[PDB]
């Protein structure tokens, strides 16, 4: 039988608990906020990316715009350069991460993702392109920029670019080719012996086609065959919404239907060479 209480261990524990509860309350206040999202949308807004640049925005990234005739505002990627030019980007290819075999509604409404860094693939949506490019008495321009698999880039410019309403199947129109070292694939290409191939591969005045909404000049279905949505003729010489091929080079054996269905621009590279990157972007013509 021994007589030792000690018991300071008990009281020292109670005090250690009361102090621990203080530490626990302090940790709670540090775990209230969510994960920080690197993706933010800018505050400045306007009719388009040029209007936004005119209001003093200097950074390329994500912005809401609302053309006058638009019922609601919508998000876009704006490219803003050191000279106050604000490009509205409506198409981007970069790495093959997004499937471009999409239907009429999907091409109408848009698909893919928008990033502040401009490092994502997307189609903005035909309805939006139509709204931006048909603002009352504001001539627009389109720039197509292409990158090959060896880091070379080229461009093609089209003056008075317009995309028509859904009632005219989002018809592509422009007044003239305004130059650029990629050449004018929208004028079609003289591929071979057939005297009508250049006429049937041009894109000016072509209605938009998807697999489920065929508005091309072919007995068959260009968009279904080539797995895309595009302003098809019979069928194409520039085809930026085509299948992404790693390394550029592909062949008839690469495809289910036997046709050139890659990301092509026939005036710059053979139709069996598929671009590493493409950008389709629009700006008021007077900025050029």
């Amino acid at each position: 039988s021994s007589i030792r209480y000690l018991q300071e261990i008990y009281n020292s524990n109670n005090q250690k608990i009361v102090n621990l509860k203080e530490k626990v309350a302090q940790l709670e206040a540090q775990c209230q906020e969510p994960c920080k999202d690197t993706v933010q949308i800018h505050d400045i807004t306007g009719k388009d990316c040029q209007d936004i640049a005119n209001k003093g925005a200097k950074q390329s990234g994500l912005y809401f715009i609302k053309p006058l005739k638009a019922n609601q505002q919508f998000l876009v990627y704006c490219e803003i350069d050191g000279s106050g030019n604000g490009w509205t980007v409506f198409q981007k290819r970069l790495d093959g991460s997004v499937d471009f075999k999409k239907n009429w509604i999907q091409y109408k409404e848009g698909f893919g993702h928008l990033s502040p860094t401009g490092t994502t693939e997307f189609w903005l949506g035909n309805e939006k392109i139509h709204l931006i490019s048909t603002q009352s008495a504001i001539p627009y321009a389109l720039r197509v920029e292409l990158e090959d698999w060896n880091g070379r880039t080229s461009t093609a410019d089209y003056a008075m670019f317009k995309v028509g309403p859904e009632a005219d199947k989002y018809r592509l129109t422009y007044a003239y080719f305004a130059g650029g070292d990629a050449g004018d694939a929208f004028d079609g290409f003289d591929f071979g012996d057939d005297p009508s191939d250049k006429f049937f591969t041009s894109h000016n005045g072509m209605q938009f086609s998807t697999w489920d909404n065929d508005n091309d000049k072919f007995e068959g279905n260009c968009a279904e065959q080539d797995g895309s949505g595009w302003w098809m003729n019979k069928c194409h010489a520039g085809h930026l919404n085509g299948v992404y091929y790693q390394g550029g080079t592909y062949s008839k054996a690469s495809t289910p239907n036997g046709y050139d269905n890659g990301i092509i621009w026939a005036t710059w590279k053979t139709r069996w060479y598929s671009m590493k990157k493409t950008t389709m972007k629009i700006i008021p013509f007077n900025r050029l």
């Binding site: 057939d194 591969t201 072919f218 068959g220 069928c235 050139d260």
Partner: peptide
């Protein structure tokens, strides 16, 4: 491309 073209469709012959």
């Amino acid at each position: 491309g073209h469709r012959p």
